[PDB]
Symmetry: D2
Subunit: 259 residues, 4 copies
């Protein structure tokens, strides 16, 4: 059991990737705390995961709420070993820089950058008390390669990537590891961008398809585990080599096939 | 001359690097506008720069003030070709993740991340009307490699690096280039009061030239990246850090042990 | 069983990292083929791994020999799923750029760059015939950060990092993944000048050098269906060696003084 | 001017990027030495550059020849300040991994990786005698982003980026800078005989300025990194590729689609 006995918190737990992750971590022996906003079916989520899974509301914009979540984990299990900072805000008016408003921008940084920082701020000493532990932060390929939307979101993911290196560095000596995952496109309900945009993206993933939630859950599980004890402060792409190839490859292939 | 007849905004112009960037840009032929907080001596900086350099106050935390800066420039010169987003907030209580307060975090993100974004928001329309132009955003080595201080600062610079890519991708078809510089340690008045000498000296050893940087050595890179010589360089993050991060840690101790 | 039913080839299988990667993969349920030079004790390494591990010589400088290894695996087990390109030549005359001899450079490139390419050249069509599979290439942190020795070696690992992307790019459509691992300092016999080893140890964030098993686990993960959506990557198993500013320990000691 | 009184060796000096980098370095005040294989027209290239440019044959595959080029420069000029390792072999048989031959591979690595190490090996001591100096190594976008051809070429370039980091680290202390430039598609005579047009047009749309580069846009970046304006830039790999690798792959067709949607 790769995570035998560890206590894990997953944020954004009612989301596509968040639910599946909680599942995989439970399946590997962890006692999972599912966390998400009050409006969501946390209870249905936890019931579905099973394996002793519990749940508690969290609002990353609220330092006291972020703190209440960790303190609840400690009330319930007496310890904390693992945290998947998976939650993320993405406003649909997050388009072009010239079109950016301060509200869309600030809402997105408050949840994503500040909130993840707060989660680390209060998780870390618990990890240290436990004898060491693991934080996995979810970033995104969008931090590394741009397009005509998600400017705020993208930039917050970049902040989180640097935040990963700071946690890893400052707390390595106390036995805490921190890594980040930059996923490519993953089939979620927050997807189900229109179909022909998805089809376009799909051709540029080297498997020829978008990812499935469990393919991110499996890297979270691994990075959260002792098998990764010499892996820290890294950003690891789970994106089917989206950025490993020259752009224009699919149409160069079609072109070569003609000529 | 490299920037003949170009109109340039330098924010943080009273600072070590910004004042010096102002000199090199104006020495390379630019009509420069020096901008910084109202309690700074903008009059004196513009005087010391000469060559028809002007000055206008700006408060990056305030969109009105950003709007007012860009418009002053257009009222005065009728065009805008270059922006150097050089201003940066850096709080002395900006220490460890676990010690972070939301006030230190937001102050920093409001000036650095949001402010730079607001500067790009209003400058881009004008640069397009020039028939293309350049934006240089200052980042920092610290975004890429961590230590026990400047976490918030570090994370905001990460954000500006992604922003830079988004600005390049979005407005390349309209003749706008955007690049970021990532300085190593650079000798400024901020620096002398931030770090004590023994630690500065330690850092100096990990720069391959065996010394820390001088402001003008960052200014020249700004100048090249803002100039038409960089016509085919856009969306990059370029380190001016004496290969601070190009060598294995422990090199000087390895070398000392070899002697 | 993370790799139940898979056939794997490990090169440099008698080495510290290669042997201990062989155990782990075998423990995961893979049928493993240990490959190394004829003067190494392959049978004893295969014995120590057990679990049906077999062995066969290979000289990575020689194309015929690489072919013979792939063909041996295929004729034995009827398939191939995993290749850990772990073998590496590391010459002790490999010092500074201005002292470099063509012999040391070429010797190092022939085994590491050309050799890794030849293993891929002939594994790829087989992995394709198996429905798809994974290749893992061992790089080195030294490719991204220089010092006063190992110049040829680091340069060959960079070439390997590029090879990895090409393999992953060219053959992704046909079911083949390829990823690279860049280790920090790991404890082996080849390793064992102590004063240098402890200096390096302070700059790994665990404050120690790596263990071979800690590289093995990552090869294992990357060779498995759990990594189905990871490909073309270079991943650091270096305890954050390059995620922090250099000078950190010395800064921390100065801060413990003042 | 930016390289006043500085002595510069440029390899591959008859090729599109080489010849144009020679002119620019020379326009910037450098005493330039054009170096390329004996079957190229070095005399014509130096006549084109003017400004006192000289020429001399080199074969990167021959250690005795690399040394002879460095010894010639010192004989003529008494010093060496700048080397632009621009020469690269690039073989049309260099297609896919599964199709790679040992000869295509070895020929490419002997010229590109080994050749460039030998240039530095013989140049660096002279850069140190002159009180410090600058090396600029030419790489390629293709070491970072893979496609269906030029595997070997691309791996040698990767080797050269790490090599750059090793020169920079080993000789920083003695006053020697070393950087690399990774170009995107640049209009040269070789792309006119290398890739067909409809493939050039596809690549062109993925470069953010909506076109392939010109050789001078590379030359200017070489010029700057060779000069004392770059004194605190060392060990880097800088892309002059109009952000070919800063955007999501598929952007142009996503834009085509979003306009129809």
């Amino acid at each position: 059991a790769e995570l035998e006995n560890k206590v894990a918190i997953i944020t954004g737990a009612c989301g596509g990737i968040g639910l599946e992750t909680s599942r995989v971590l439970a399946r590997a022996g962890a006692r999972v705390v599912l966390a998400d906003l009050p409006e969501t079916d946390l209870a249905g989520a936890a019931a579905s995961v099973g394996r002793g899974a519990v749940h508690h509301v969290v609002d990353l914009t609220n330092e006291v709420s972020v703190r209440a979540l960790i303190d609840f984990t400690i009330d319930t299990f007496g310890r904390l070993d693992i945290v998947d900072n998976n939650a993320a805000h993405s406003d649909p008016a997050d388009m072009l820089v010239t079109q950016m408003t301060v509200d869309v921008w600030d809402d997105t940084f408050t949840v994503n950058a500040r909130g993840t920082m707060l989660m680390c701020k209060y998780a870390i000493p618990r990890l240290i008390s436990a004898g060491g532990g693991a934080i996995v932060n979810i970033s995104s390929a969008t931090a590394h390669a741009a397009y005509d939307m998600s400017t705020a979101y993208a930039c917050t993911k970049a902040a989180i990537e640097t935040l990963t290196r700071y946690v890893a560095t400052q707390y390595g000596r106390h036995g805490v590891r921190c890594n980040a995952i930059a996923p490519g496109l993953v089939r979620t309900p927050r997807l189900e961008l229109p179909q022909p945009i998805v089809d376009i993206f799909a051709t540029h993933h080297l498997a020829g398809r978008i990812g499935e939630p469990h393919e991110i859950a499996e890297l979270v599980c691994f990075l959260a585990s002792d098998r990764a004890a010499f892996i820290t402060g890294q950003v690891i792409a789970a994106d089917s080599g989206l950025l490993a190839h020259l752009p224009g490859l699919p149409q160069i292939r079609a072109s070569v096939a003609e000529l």
